[PDB]
Task: inverse folding
């Protein structure tokens, strides 16, 4: 039962250690998401100011 | 059938690619004439590679192997690294305008 | 001992179904990034043009 | 990129940064390996909040022929973001870093294809 | 900044000057303007 | 640079150079100070015109621990171009000299900034 009970521990520990990385992904998303969503609004804005200069 | 499921689960949660079950491909853009390069590596099934190249969104795109979570983290890392470059260039444009 | 394999497999499928979503989201974000990038370049061109034109008008005046 | 400027955010008050600037600069020199062919220079120091300070640096590298030039910003940033180096930086109070170079689309594509 | 430049141009427009011909034009709007549009 | 080769042009016929090579080599040794820690070696002799001969040399220097190595070409050229040494060389019939090392841009910049 030793090798088994140890193996299950190591395995479940590794999986849990992987899920920590999964969580690490989950954590770094919303911020980056806002940052990303910010972009199209600016380029869609700067493109407008350019049109202003060109019309000027 | 017990020590098979266990080994298969140990195989699923792993970067060795024995049916990793975290197999998704992301297309990285690369201008010609660099398409002939890339060129997978250690444990790439030409099946998956070609099947990725098959449903290609647009030319000059090469698929990229995302096995599990550190890879998607890395993809994010790049995405930020380019985020900042984008904002910078955009601000340059803004300033010149 | 089956009650452990059940947990393992459930967790596996559960987190797989989520990892797929994350990856998909990342892909969509990439698409957004390049889609905008093209426009950024267009802005670079348009801007350079504007710059040159303004310089010309400066020369004219 | 040739100007080699890296902005660092420190979780320290501006007065503390300036008060021990010699020590801070040498610690950054040590993080880089401490060789006499590298010299850390402070471009600017700016308060950002009560306990947040931005410190802009560049690094001058000397060649065997006595020539000097700045380490490119991308190259320097790449060094500082390596996991071991980042950890050492965090021990000095660094909580973030930024380069000014606006990467090309092909550079960005390369970073996304090979995030490590 | 486009509409802004449209205003600015249409602002500088109706304000002089000594250009040997182009005097500032009076602005209408809304009620009179619709009819002025229909009378096109 | 480690090969230490310096090409010298002499305003002498090849037969004259070869005919008195022992003497020529010792005179070069004297120009270097004549110590027993320096040895002039002839790498090659080539006629260039009726009364012009190229002589390629290097100098082996011995350390206090018995170790030997060639004097670097740049270092040796720097010695020979010093005004006093150049004049002595000209008295032996030397009308020009060249090192093979292709200097770096930073080295070249340093030489231009400090031509003396």
Result:
């Amino acid at each position: 039962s030793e090798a088994l009970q140890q193996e299950i521990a190591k395995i479940d520990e590794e999986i849990q250690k992987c899920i920590r990385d999964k969580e690490a992904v989950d954590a770094f998303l919303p911020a980056h998401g806002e940052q990303l969503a910010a972009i199209p609004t600016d380029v869609n804005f700067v493109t407008r100011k350019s049109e202003g200069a060109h019309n000027a | 059938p017990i020590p098979e499921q266990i080994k298969l689960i140990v195989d699923k949660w792993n970067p060795n690619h024995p049916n990793c079950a975290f197999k998704t491909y992301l297309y990285n853009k690369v201008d010609e004439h660099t398409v002939p390069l890339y060129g997978p590596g250690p444990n790439e099934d030409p099946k998956e590679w070609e099947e990725a190249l098959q449903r290609k969104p647009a030319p000059n795109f090469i698929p990229v192997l995302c096995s599990g979570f550190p890879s998607i983290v890395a993809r994010l890392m790049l995405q930020r690294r380019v985020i900042t470059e984008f904002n910078n260039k955009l601000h340059q444009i803004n300033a010149s305008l | 001992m089956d009650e452990i394999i059940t947990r393992w497999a459930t967790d596996l499928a559960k987190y797989q179904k989520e990892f797929k979503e994350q990856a998909a989201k990342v892909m969509e974000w990439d698409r957004l990034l390049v889609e905008n990038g093209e426009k950024i370049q267009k802005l670079y061109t348009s801007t350079y043009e504007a710059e040159r034109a303004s310089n010309e008008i400066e020369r004219q005046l | 990129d040739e100007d080699g400027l890296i902005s660092l955010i420190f979780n320290k008050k501006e007065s503390d940064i300036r008060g021990q600037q010699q020590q801070l600069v040498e610690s950054l020199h040590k993080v880089l390996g401490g060789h006499q062919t590298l010299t850390v220079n402070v471009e600017g120091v700016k308060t950002k909040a009560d306990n947040q300070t931005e410190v802009i640096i560049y690094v001058v590298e000397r060649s065997p022929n006595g020539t000097s030039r700045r380490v490119g910003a991308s190259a320097l940033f790449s060094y500082f973001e390596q996991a071991h180096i980042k950890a050492n930086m965090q021990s000095l109070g660094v909580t973030g870093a930024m380069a000014q170079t606006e990467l090309s689309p092909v550079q960005i594509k390369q970073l996304i294809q090979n995030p490590l | 900044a486009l509409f802004d430049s449209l205003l600015a141009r249409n602002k500088k427009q109706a304000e002089g000057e000594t250009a040997l011909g182009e005097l500032p034009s009076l602005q209408l709007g809304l009620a009179d303007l619709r009819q002025r549009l229909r009378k096109l």
